[PDB]
Ligand binder design. Structure first.
Ligand SMILES: [Mg+2]
Ligand SMILES: [Mg+2]
Ligand SMILES: [Mg+2]
Ligand SMILES: [Mg+2]
Ligand SMILES: [Mg+2]
Ligand SMILES: [Mg+2]
Ligand SMILES: [Mg+2]
Ligand SMILES: [Mg+2]
Ligand SMILES: [Mg+2]
Ligand SMILES: [Mg+2]
Ligand SMILES: [Mg+2]
Ligand SMILES: [Mg+2]
Ligand SMILES: [Mg+2]
Ligand SMILES: [Mg+2]
Ligand SMILES: [Mg+2]
Ligand SMILES: [Mg+2]
Ligand SMILES: [Mg+2]
Ligand SMILES: [Mg+2]
Ligand SMILES: [Mg+2]
Ligand SMILES: [Mg+2]
Ligand SMILES: [Mg+2]
Ligand SMILES: [Mg+2]
Ligand SMILES: [Mg+2]
Ligand SMILES: [Mg+2]
Ligand SMILES: [Mg+2]
Ligand SMILES: [Mg+2]
Ligand SMILES: [Mg+2]
Ligand SMILES: [Mg+2]
Ligand SMILES: [Mg+2]
Ligand SMILES: [Mg+2]
Ligand SMILES: [Mg+2]
Ligand SMILES: [Mg+2]
Ligand SMILES: [Mg+2]
Ligand SMILES: [Mg+2]
Ligand SMILES: [Mg+2]
Ligand SMILES: [Mg+2]
Ligand SMILES: [Mg+2]
Ligand SMILES: [Mg+2]
Ligand SMILES: [Mg+2]
Ligand SMILES: [Mg+2]
Ligand SMILES: [Mg+2]
Lengths: 71, 117, 65, 84, 142, 94
RNA sequence: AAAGGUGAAAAGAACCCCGGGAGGGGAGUGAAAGAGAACCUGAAACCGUGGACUUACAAGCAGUCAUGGCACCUUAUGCGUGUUAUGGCGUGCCUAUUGAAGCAUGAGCCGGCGACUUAGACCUGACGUGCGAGCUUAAGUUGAAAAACGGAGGCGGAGC
RNA sequence: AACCGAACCUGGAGAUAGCUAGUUCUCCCCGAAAUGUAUUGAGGUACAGCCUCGGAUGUUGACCAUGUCCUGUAGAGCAC
RNA sequence: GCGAGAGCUAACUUCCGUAGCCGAGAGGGAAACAACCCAGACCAUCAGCUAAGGUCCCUAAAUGAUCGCUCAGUGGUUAA
RNA sequence: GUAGGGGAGCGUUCAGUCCGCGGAGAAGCCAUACCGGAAGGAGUGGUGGAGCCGACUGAAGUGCGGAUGCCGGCAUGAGU
C-alpha cells in the first residue's frame, strides 16, 4: 500500500457532460450538424459529397512483390 | 460495479433549500424553484455590494447639503470651500459631523466660506 | 479489427523516406493534342501533394505500401 | 390580384479575376526569374536584365535590385541594377 | 456606523402662497415635506415637516397659464377623459391645484402617499390649525 | 483620524477594526489627526499637529462571504469563498 | 405486472375502559410496543394542530441591499438567529437564436431510474516506465491461495 | 375484430434518421467563427481562414517615422 | 456610421466594401431600450477623483454667474 | 466571456492495504449561527438499532432541472 505511480503516468479520462464545470450541455460536439449526431459514420475519406482527390488522381503501374533483399 | 445516487442528490438539494428559508411559497419549499430563485439572487447580491457603496455616498451627501444650507451655504460651494482650506474630510465623516455635532459643523462652515472669500 | 488499406490509394500514392506523400500529375489521357508538348511532358510525371492532403493519404495505406 | 413574372436578366455574367499589376516594386531585391509585372500590354517595357514572356509578363534575368523608369508617360521601363 | 435618528419632532410651519408662482411654491413645500433641509435626513422614514398652505386662491400663474393650463382626469368608462382649465380648477376648488402639483413632486410608493397627509391646503386668509402653532416660512430662493 | 484609505471617528477607549496592519499583539501605532473630537474643535493643519495613539489589539479574519456571479442563458455560474483580514485597535490619543 | 423486513425468541398482548364494529387508551410481556401484527430505518412532495412575529390604502419574476421594530440565545450576547416595517434596486429557468421576461419550446410537484461507453491485440499523438542498436512475444505448456516457460511471429535496421 | 391507399402478432431490430429534443460536480488559463472556394450543394459535409495545448526557434510580430516604387477613385476637365 | 449597387436617394429592406459594437459585454448615460454615447467588471470596503451625461421637486449635484434671444408652452417631432 | 482547447481538484460506489471506531450505540435520517478558494468538510444535539469513518492505491453502471423523458407518490382545478 505504501506505493504510488509516477507523476504523469496516469491522467484521469474525459467525462464529458457532467455539468457547467466542465463541458456543459453539448459535450464538445458543438451545435447541431451531422457531426453532432450520434451514429457510427462518415467516415474519414469522405470529402463533401463531392468527388474525391484520390478518385481524381491517375493510377500508375501494376503491383508486384518480387524479391526483397535483406540489407 | 454500479454506483447509485444514494445520498448525494438529497444533500445538494437540502443545501439549496436551506439557503432558501423565508422565501415565499414554493420558492422556499420546492428545490427547483429554490435553486432558480437563487440564481437571480446571485445577480442581486453581487450587484448590490457595489451598489450599496453607491447608495451610502448618496446619503452622506444629502445630509451634508442639508447642514450646509442651514447656515446659508449650498453644498457644492461648501465642499470647494473645504478643499480650498485643505480640510480633508470624508463625507461619511462630514455627514456625521453635520448631523451629530452642530457647533463643529458650523465652525467648518465658517472656515470654508473664509476659504471662499 | 485491423484497419484496412485503402486500395484506391495503392496505385496513385507513394510514401517517402522522410514521411511525406507523393502522386502523379494529371491530365494526360485525351487532353493531348492541346498540347503543349511541355505540358504533356510535365504531366506524365510525379510530384508531392501540397500538404493539407497528407493526413488522409497516410490513413489510406497504414503499411506505407 | 398577384403578378406572374415573367422577365429575367440577360446579364449577370463576368469572368474570374485576373490578378494583374506589378508584383515587384521600386527598390526590391530579386532572385533570378522572379516576376515583376503581369500586364495586358506594353504598359511596362523591359529594360536591362528583364525579359518578357508572351503574357507581356516581365521577369528578371540575373538577380539584382529593381528600378523603375518612368520616361514621361506611356513609355516606361523596369530594370535590374545589382548592388555594388 | 452612520447615524439613524428618532422621529421626535412633528414640526409644523405655515406657508402663504399669495402671489407666488405655483411650481416654485410647490418645490419649497414638496421639499420641506420630503425631509431634505434636515441635516440628519433619513430616507426610509418620513421626517418631513407639516405644511399648512394659505391663500391658495391667490396663487400666481405665469400667463397665459390660466386659460391654457389643462388638468386631466380619467374615469374608467369610455369617454371618461374629463378636463378642466387652471382658472376653472382655481374657482371650483383651488386647494386641489396645490395638492396636485405638490403631490406630483413627492414619491409615488407607499411612503409618498403617506406623505400627502402632512399637507394641509386652505384657500384665503385663515386656517383651523392654530393649536399646532406653526411657525411661518417665507417664500425664498435662499 | 484615518487608516486603510478611510477616515474613522474616535474619541477615547474604543476598539476599531481596520484592514490588516503590520505588527503584532501589543504593538503601538501613532496617527495624525484630521479633526479634534471635542472642545473648541480643530481641523486641517491644527489637527495634523495633534496626534493619536493606539494599541494593536488583535489580528482577525472577517466574516465569511460567498461570491456568486450569474448570467442567464449562458450557463455561467460562479461560486467563490471570501474572508477580509483586519486588525483590532484600541485608542488613547492626546 | 407490483410484489420483501415484528422480535433474540410469539413470550402474537389474558384482563379492564369508550365503540355495533373499526380504532384506540390502559395493563401484562419485551431491553425496546420510541418493535403490536396496515409491525426495520421512515427522507421529499403533499394535508393538518399549536406557538412566535406579522398582514384589511394595496401594483408584486416575489428576490436583493440598507435601516428601524419585535423576539430569541446549545457551533449564540454579535460578524448574531428568526421575524418583520419602510426605502433603493431588480424583465423566471432552460432550449433555440441576428436578437428571449417575451404573448416562442419544454415543464403540476417531490423522490427515485435516466445519456460520450465497450471492444480490437487495429491506426496515430501526449505523458510515463522497462530494456536499448536493439525491443517484444501469440496461440499454447506447466504451475496455480502465485507465475514461469513458450521466438512462431511482429516492430527498428535503406532508400529509389 | 372500435383509426386499412395495404390488418395484426413476433422476429431482422439498438433498421436508417445530414432532423428536433436532451446531455448531470467545482475552480483557474486562454478563447473563436457565422468569411473563401468546392459540393444532386445551399439549416449538411471537405480544405483553407480564425481558437487552444505542446515542442522548436529567437524580435523575425506590432505600431509609428524616413526612403522608394505601384494606383486611376474623390475632384476636375472636355483633348478622344 | 461612411462607400456603392439593387429598391421609390422606401423599409427594424436586400447584396458587397470599410470601422466599431452586440453576438460572447456586466457597469454609468440615452424614461424604458442587443446595437448609440462613456466605459472592458480577480475578490473585500458605510473611502477619494473623474468619463458620457447631468445639478427646480420626484432624483445625486449651482433655483450658478454675465451679455443677449424667444412669450410661441416654441421648447416637447414634417414640407412647398 | 458562448462554442472549443488546456490546468488543479471536490463527491459517489466497489477493490487492495494501513489506521481505527461501534450496544456507554454504527450506517441512514433530522436541526444548526463553525471550517475550507469552490465542488465540499467537521463540532454538538435529536433519531435510529448493526454495522462503519479517515489515508494511500485501483477499477467504474460515478454526480441531473429539464428530454410533451420512465416508474411512483401526492397536489391544482374543488367540496366544483
Ligand atoms: Mg476540461
Ligand atoms: Mg441542462
Ligand atoms: Mg442542442
Ligand atoms: Mg463609485
Ligand atoms: Mg435576465
Ligand atoms: Mg446568447
Ligand atoms: Mg380491539
Ligand atoms: Mg398557525
Ligand atoms: Mg389613498
Ligand atoms: Mg395598512
Ligand atoms: Mg427567429
Ligand atoms: Mg449564437
Ligand atoms: Mg408569459
Ligand atoms: Mg414562455
Ligand atoms: Mg419551434
Ligand atoms: Mg403547456
Ligand atoms: Mg516515450
Ligand atoms: Mg375497422
Ligand atoms: Mg432507434
Ligand atoms: Mg440489421
Ligand atoms: Mg481575455
Ligand atoms: Mg447551425
Ligand atoms: Mg479545419
Ligand atoms: Mg519589423
Ligand atoms: Mg466625379
Ligand atoms: Mg436589414
Ligand atoms: Mg451593455
Ligand atoms: Mg446598459
Ligand atoms: Mg435606468
Ligand atoms: Mg433596438
Ligand atoms: Mg463634463
Ligand atoms: Mg437634490
Ligand atoms: Mg475568464
Ligand atoms: Mg476501503
Ligand atoms: Mg456501506
Ligand atoms: Mg423531473
Ligand atoms: Mg400536455
Ligand atoms: Mg405520472
Ligand atoms: Mg357547496
Ligand atoms: Mg368553477
Ligand atoms: Mg355550481
Amino acid at each position: 500500500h505504501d506505493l504510488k505511480p509516477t507523476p504523469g503516468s496516469r491522467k484521469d479520462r474525459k467525462r464529458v457532460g457532467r455539468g457547467p464545470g466542465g463541458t456543459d450541455k453539448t459535450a464538445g460536439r458543438g451545435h447541431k450538424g451531422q457531426k453532432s449526431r450520434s451514429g457510427a459514420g462518415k467516415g474519414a475519406f469522405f470529402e463533401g459529397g463531392r468527388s474525391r482527390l484520390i478518385a481524381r488522381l491517375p493510377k500508375r503501374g501494376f503491383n508486384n512483390v518480387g524479391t526483397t533483399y535483406e540489407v | 460495479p454500479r454506483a447509485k445516487t444514494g445520498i448525494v442528490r438529497r444533500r445538494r438539494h437540502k443545501k439549496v433549500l436551506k439557503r432558501a428559508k423565508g422565501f415565499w411559497g414554493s420558492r422556499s419549499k420546492q428545490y427547483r424553484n429554490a435553486f432558480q430563485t437563487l440564481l437571480n439572487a446571485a445577480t442581486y447580491e453581487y450587484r448590490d455590494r457595489r451598489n450599496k457603496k453607491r447608495d451610502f455616498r448618496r446619503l452622506w451627501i444629502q445630509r451634508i447639503n442639508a447642514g450646509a444650507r442651514l447656515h446659508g451655504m449650498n453644498y457644492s460651494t461648501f465642499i470647494n470651500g473645504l478643499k480650498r482650506a485643505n480640510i480633508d474630510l470624508n463625507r461619511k465623516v462630514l455627514a456625521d459631523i453635520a448631523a451629530r455635532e452642530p457647533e463643529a459643523f458650523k465652525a467648518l462652515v465658517d472656515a470654508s466660506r473664509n476659504a471662499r472669500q | 479489427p485491423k484497419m484496412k488499406t485503402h486500395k484506391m490509394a495503392k496505385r496513385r500514392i507513394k510514401i517517402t523516406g522522410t514521411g511525406k506523400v507523393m502522386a502523379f500529375k494529371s491530365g494526360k489521357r485525351h487532353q493531348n493534342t492541346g498540347k503543349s508538348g511541355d505540358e504533356i511532358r510535365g504531366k506524365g510525371k510525379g510530384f508531392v501533394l501540397a500538404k493539407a492532403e497528407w493526413a488522409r493519404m497516410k490513413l489510406m495505406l497504414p503499411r506505407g505500401k | 390580384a398577384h403578378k406572374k413574372g415573367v422577365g429575367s436578366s440577360k446579364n449577370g455574367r463576368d469572368s474570374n479575376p485576373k490578378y494583374l499589376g506589378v508584383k515587384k516594386f521600386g527598390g526590391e531585391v530579386v532572385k533570378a526569374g522572379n516576376i515583376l509585372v503581369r500586364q495586358r500590354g506594353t504598359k511596362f517595357k523591359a529594360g536591362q536584365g528583364v525579359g518578357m514572356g508572351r503574357d507581356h509578363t516581365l521577369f528578371a534575368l540575373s538577380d539584382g535590385k529593381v528600378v523603375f523608369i518612368n520616361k514621361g508617360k506611356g513609355a516606361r521601363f523596369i530594370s535590374i541594377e545589382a548592388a555594388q | 456606523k452612520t447615524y439613524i435618528p428618532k422621529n421626535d419632532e412633528q414640526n409644523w410651519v405655515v406657508v402663504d402662497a399669495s402671489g407666488v408662482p405655483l411650481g416654485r411654491l410647490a418645490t419649497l413645500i414638496a421639499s420641506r415635506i420630503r425631509g431634505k433641509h434636515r441635516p440628519d435626513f433619513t430616507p426610509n422614514m418620513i421626517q418631513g415637516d407639516f405644511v399648512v398652505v394659505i391663500n391658495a386662491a391667490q396663487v400666481a400663474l405665469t400667463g397665459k397659464k390660466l386659460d391654457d393650463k389643462v388638468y386631466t382626469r380619467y374615469t374608467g368608462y369610455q369617454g371618461g377623459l374629463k378636463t378642466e382649465t387652471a382658472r376653472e380648477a382655481l374657482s371650483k376648488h383651488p386647494e386641489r391645484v396645490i395638492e396636485h402639483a405638490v403631490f406630483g413632486m413627492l414619491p409615488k410608493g407607499r411612503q409618498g402617499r403617506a406623505m400627502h397627509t402632512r399637507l394641509k391646503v386652505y384657500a384665503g386668509e385663515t386656517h383651523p390649525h392654530s393649536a399646532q402653532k406653526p411657525q411661518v416660512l417665507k417664500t425664498q430662493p435662499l | 483620524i484615518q487608516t486603510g484609505g478611510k477616515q474613522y471617528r474616535v474619541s477615547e477607549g474604543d476598539v476599531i477594526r481596520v484592514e490588516s496592519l503590520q505588527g503584532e499583539a501589543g504593538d503601538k501605532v501613532e496617527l495624525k489627526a484630521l479633526f479634534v473630537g471635542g472642545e473648541q474643535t480643530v481641523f486641517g493643519e491644527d489637527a495634523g499637529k495633534y496626534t493619536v495613539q493606539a494599541e494593536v489589539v488583535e489580528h482577525g479574519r472577517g466574516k465569511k462571504i460567498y461570491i456568486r456571479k450569474y448570467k442567464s442563458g449562458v450557463q455561467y455560474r460562479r461560486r467563490t469563498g471570501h474572508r477580509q483580514n483586519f486588525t483590532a485597535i484600541k485608542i488613547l490619543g492626546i
